[PDB]
Symmetry: D2
Subunit: 260 residues, 4 copies
Amino acid sequence: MNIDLKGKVAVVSGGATLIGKAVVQALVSAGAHVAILDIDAKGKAIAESFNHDVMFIQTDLTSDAAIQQAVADIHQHLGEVSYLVNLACTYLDDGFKSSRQDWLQALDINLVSTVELSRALYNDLKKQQGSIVNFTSISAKVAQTGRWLYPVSKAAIRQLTQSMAMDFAADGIRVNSVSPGWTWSRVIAEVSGNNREKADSVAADYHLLGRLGHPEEVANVVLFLLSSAASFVTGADYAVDGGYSVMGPEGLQPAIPRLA
Amino acid sequence: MNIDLKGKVAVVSGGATLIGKAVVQALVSAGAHVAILDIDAKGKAIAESFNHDVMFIQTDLTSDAAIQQAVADIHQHLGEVSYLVNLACTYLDDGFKSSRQDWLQALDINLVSTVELSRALYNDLKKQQGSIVNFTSISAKVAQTGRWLYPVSKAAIRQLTQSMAMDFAADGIRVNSVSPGWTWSRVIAEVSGNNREKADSVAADYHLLGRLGHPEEVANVVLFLLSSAASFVTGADYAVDGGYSVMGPEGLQPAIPRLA
Amino acid sequence: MNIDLKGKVAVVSGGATLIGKAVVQALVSAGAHVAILDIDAKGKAIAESFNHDVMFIQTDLTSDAAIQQAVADIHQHLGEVSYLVNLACTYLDDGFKSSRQDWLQALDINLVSTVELSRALYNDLKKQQGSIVNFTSISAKVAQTGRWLYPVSKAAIRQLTQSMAMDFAADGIRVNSVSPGWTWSRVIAEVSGNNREKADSVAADYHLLGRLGHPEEVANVVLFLLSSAASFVTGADYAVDGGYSVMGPEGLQPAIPRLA
Amino acid sequence: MNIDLKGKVAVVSGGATLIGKAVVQALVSAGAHVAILDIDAKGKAIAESFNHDVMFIQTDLTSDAAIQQAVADIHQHLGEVSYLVNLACTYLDDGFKSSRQDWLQALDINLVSTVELSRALYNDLKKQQGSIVNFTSISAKVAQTGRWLYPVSKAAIRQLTQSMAMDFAADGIRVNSVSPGWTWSRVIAEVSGNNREKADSVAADYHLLGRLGHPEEVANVVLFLLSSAASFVTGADYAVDGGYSVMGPEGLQPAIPRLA
């Protein structure tokens, strides 16, 4: 996976997550400069890890003013933007117990802000004929007990990816979505006691490949879809879930014999 | 379609539309008492045509207080609710031009308010072990130029229908969705000049059956899903789109010959 | 579910299964005469159960001559056919171990014969402006370990339903598919020891409604789609699986806590 | 797209097509040795252009003996196979007019032969822990007037891809599918008069990106899925259709205005 994006500029929302850092590293390795927009402070450290190749801009994407200031800063330090990766999300989700206020907050962060960040960067993507990668999940294709806000948000992101693709094609912008499964996480790392083999064995029940996915494995699909190798891919959902979404409630274990 | 729902109480949000009127008539004909919730005053007239069997309650479903008051009125005049048909929606939609405020408004009306209305009625549906029908669209499965808010809202309703089904099954409540295509509507009647054969001529290009759907044809599917005949149907999306969703950009006309 | 199909004639392939008998009973109750086409001899008993309302014609649907003779017999004893329910299938399936010969046999029985039986009845369905119901499964939407021939066959039936819908619409014929989950079966009845409560508790892990489906519950959806209440439903897949298809490998039980 | 597959051996059925040629070139450029299996003699010329790195073996994949001999020749000249690209297909397709014999022939070539070729190569892919790429189409997700056999065959390939992924995961073999839209082809070049801009003008109505796809653009996705960058991708369908599959019968042009 030796793609060449020398001189290009990329924007990565929610770049403080392990997937976010893998996406940033993938872009830097390809020669691109990256601006990380996130509310989490840890992002700063990530940016410093790449010295002048990556810049961190703490941004509340629900604030239009914060987005305008972030794009101004990107223009001042890096230049015109070619790639946008919308990875920002909130895990505010208590199913039926979540309130109307929680619903609107989660939708604003997970969905509406993707529109506003794309809009603030649209003229750049138009001039550069760039590409956009949004993030769905296996949760956008299936129901999970007790989780409403994030699955519904991600299903909505899927449709938004299609509509953006259609209405952005005229300007030469490609828009796709990436649908991962269980990926090694900071949260999983802490609840598991930083024990990867056990977390993998738990995940084996829901992934044909028998483990959690690596952030790098997700980042590869992001970079492919951004690159010109995917020049005839727009509006598509690229699954990187180790086979999660081909299975139903029976999993990968026989079910008929239980009847006897 | 001669189902018996004698004595059962149904609530139909967005009941002032042609679809809503057809659903109300289908329910009354089946012996049910109906509460019409809508922000449109036309609903009043509709209810009056059915004398004491149908009630109208002008409701802004974005107001929690309005929902509590609507449920109180239903309790006073009709009683415990068995069926909920979430048909309320807004067509506030300017594609990419729609603002953040427009996004959150359309999501509040189309999606979050469905949750709040379901929550206010949940104890009724649990005691009665009733059923819920949400409304998706052909717009939740495909992209349409210049339309973002309503397609995305309906794509979100589809996932919400699945997650509602899962977390409500334990209480014996079924939840499904209905996906109609182009159906005869007030707006189409106004742009058509109240010319149905002309509008049918336009819609033939997008429906295998060569016309717009009738509101009653949609109401039939709604009624089936509410009834006990659908007693093993939960979390499903039932299309009533005259073949719209089986087609792609080629429509129903051959396309290869055009290359010669 | 009191539909009126007086005087109509229906053909039910594979009518010897419990689902088949439920579909036949549903049609008879609606006033229709039914011809059961099947290779299984038990069908004869089923037909006798309805005296002169149902006729049995032992038919090898892989034999074109047998199909022509069956349609001749239907015309001699019953008349012009209005409804066709393609329920015939084989469970010849050993996954990767199944041979090319097994593959072609299973595809011939499960798929190609549906085309030939529709073709032999096409002029009837055209004159009567009838409807067709094919049978998919939850197996057409997901992968199941060790089962290739039947899932692939059913996925192919799904696409065939769409293509038939498109190319039959001009003649006023509607074509849909029904997708059930685990339904109480003869095979399940024998391996379970005719113990329904235990089989239901096994199935609860894969159906939100916590049991196997009843054949009658599937038959209701078949009859709806055949009837004129579904007059704007063509090319659609109507799930009657108690919520099986809304779930993934996590089932309906929490999965995050296992990580701790 | 600078992947390193040095020393690895790939097999490409149906390699005489433009897609196949692009995939062969992509693999060779990545350092792989390629075996071209096809019934078309044009493949011979293709292989000769790459001297000793690419081999051509004229094969009727419906003949088990031919497959065994093709694997023997691959073993003699190149060695153990790591990658399999199932691209062989027939366009024998007359919709409803196609006979039972035509159905079984098209299914044998398009679908069952994929299984037999995978089975003959399975021990290789298991030892090498390789990957398989099947070919679906935009025709597996939608209905097209007058075309049954190929759309249904491809819909079946989609499910076969999922079931292969599941039952091959234990052996470390990934299996995915690629779904292209209208791609430049020999047949289009013949009906077009070798006029690419004209054919692009026709295809713009069915692809957001306003043209036919290039064979190389499809080959890029094939190569990504074969490579270790897709190491958490199994059982997925990767669309490379220029936005075809996000559209319905309305295409990318507004349709509501037509009603006025």
